[PDB]
Amino acid sequence: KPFLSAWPSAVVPRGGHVTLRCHYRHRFNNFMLYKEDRIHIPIFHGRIFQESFNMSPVTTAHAGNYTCRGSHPHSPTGWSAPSNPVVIMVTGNHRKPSLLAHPGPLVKSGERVILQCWSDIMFEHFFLHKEGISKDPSRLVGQIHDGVSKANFSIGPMMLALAGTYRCYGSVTHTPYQLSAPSDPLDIVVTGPYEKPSLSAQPGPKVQAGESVTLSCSSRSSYDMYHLSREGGAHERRLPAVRKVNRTFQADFPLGPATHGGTYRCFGSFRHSPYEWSDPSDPLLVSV
Amino acid sequence: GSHSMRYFYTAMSRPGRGEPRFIAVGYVDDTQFVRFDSDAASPRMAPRAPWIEQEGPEYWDGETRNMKASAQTYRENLRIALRYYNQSEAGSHIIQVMYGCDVGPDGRLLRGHNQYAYDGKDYIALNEDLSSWTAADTAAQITQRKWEAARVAEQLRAYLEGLCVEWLRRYLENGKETLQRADPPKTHVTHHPISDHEATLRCWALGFYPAEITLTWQRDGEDQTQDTELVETRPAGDRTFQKWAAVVVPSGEEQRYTCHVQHEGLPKPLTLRWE
């Protein structure tokens, strides 16, 4: 049986593009396509795709459950057994749901996290999808509570393969292959076991005025980058690590003139690996 | 001897041809004893030698979980490698890993090994001290910084000193009558004319284990190491091996040629001749 695949992704937005490929006998030629309902009625009036089938721009009509049959000349039928099934899900068809992480988006290596998807719309199903090429979404049935529909996706035990940007989607009863617009993205970062850096303030953590405060992240481990995070509010900030004379790798985060302090932590990370951070530094309370 | 255990992993991407695939095989000396292949409908670690088959369900279940986790890890490593080398997601790439331990006659650790490759070239390797790395290029230097930051070498050292040795000893016991009993080669010489003035003498060794063997041709006691055709040692398919050595000799001078066979299953080296 052939290998059917979607490129770059089976989860694809309206207006986007996706290509179905049917690999059979070391070849991408000569195949027909079937949807799950009419599993012996070849679509497009029995069209024989000479090359890979390019759906572009993608419409809601492209959504569905596909199998392919490759050309097989000398056989009871001129075609192969059915390939593996590929579900093309088309997004952007309903208002987006909301996605949040419990207890938070920074997940210690080996631990579990709950990604809760919810909406005021009565979605029959929720889909959780990590962004990336050739990724398979997870599906859960939508539970109902006081007029909101929701699902809890369990992610873990945490590892780098599970870290990345996640989006969740809803779908309604009669169009299961049509997904909502995506939720706002959620960056799920695995932390550790890379050793925690040290966070200090210069000239110190007590500042009023008028006065400049700079927060230094430092480690003897060779991090390429440091991430400074304040509890709540202020967004994540990042800077390249610089190796000092005493062989520490350090970054200096200047604050102010606004910043009303708060509790800070910093993380180390390496080049080309944005979703795996070190263990968090000890907290540092900055007071204005 | 003097034995070894090795695991060999191959993780391959093949966009449009299949899902990424992970195959693992385990060897004691020259004998494969386990396999795992992610393409199977329901992948499991499986026995590939009879002496491991009576190992309990706890063993197969544990090894199956470990292989599933490793497969996941290496699929992600293929993606990471794509980023490290700035390569397109359309291409097919391969990560290979070999690791394991060598032990002496007393069953004690002699040496540990853990080496990785990307697309058939050295990528990163654990040093003999089992506490530091050698990175072959800048990408691998990224990996090195991570592994040093995560104390990976300590965990691997713990494996190689502990479980690797203990289990190799156990397998050597389980399979003693095949793994620790050398099978000597059955040998013979054949003769094939080439021309009216030259002919080939071929010295055969068959059905021997382990694979290590030495076949030499001598002419009045002097090695013909320059004029000997030596075929690669090859598996017979029954967990024994085969090899031959050939030499072109002038016709009627065959009797001046001797084949010398060295193998651990032989008490003393053999010397054969044609008729």
Binding site: M159, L160, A161, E276 | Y7, A24, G26, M45, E63, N66, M67, A69, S70, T73, Y74, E76, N77, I80, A81, Y84, Y99, N114, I142, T143, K146, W147, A150, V152, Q155, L156, Y159, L163, C164, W167
Partner: peptide, 9 residues
């Protein structure tokens, strides 16, 4: 017995 130590690149 296979190594329980698998880390990412």
């Amino acid at each position: 017995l296979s190594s329980p130590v698998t880390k990412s690149f």
